[PDB]
Amino acid sequence: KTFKQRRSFEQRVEDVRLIREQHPTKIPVIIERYKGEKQLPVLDKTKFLVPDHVNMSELIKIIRRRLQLNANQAFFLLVNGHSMVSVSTPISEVYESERDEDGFLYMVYASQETF
């Protein structure tokens, strides 16, 4: 069961509302593994709050360090079910253009560029 299946729409919108009362500039990001990925490990946690000014290469480098991936392993992020943005892009601009109708920014990761 994915995050969207676990929590209802009403509950997810409330989550986002609550968390941005506390942290008005931080980005609520849902990070999950792509259903078909076997090589990369599932992340310990799903819900992340990330600062506005962090860019995508910084975000991927964080997650790589959390997962202790060795240097030769590939790591790709697919956003909102379709978007592979430039890694130079701050996560705040991604949230502006790619956030879900519930207020979360959904991503999935994999080690293959196809999805």
Binding site: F48, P51, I62
Partner: peptide, 16 residues
């Protein structure tokens, strides 16, 4: 068993 995971500055710095 709390869902919200914030990245510390320590963690963010170490990325760069």
């Amino acid at each position: 068993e709390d869902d919200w995971t914030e990245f510390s500055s320590e963690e963010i710095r170490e990325a760069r």
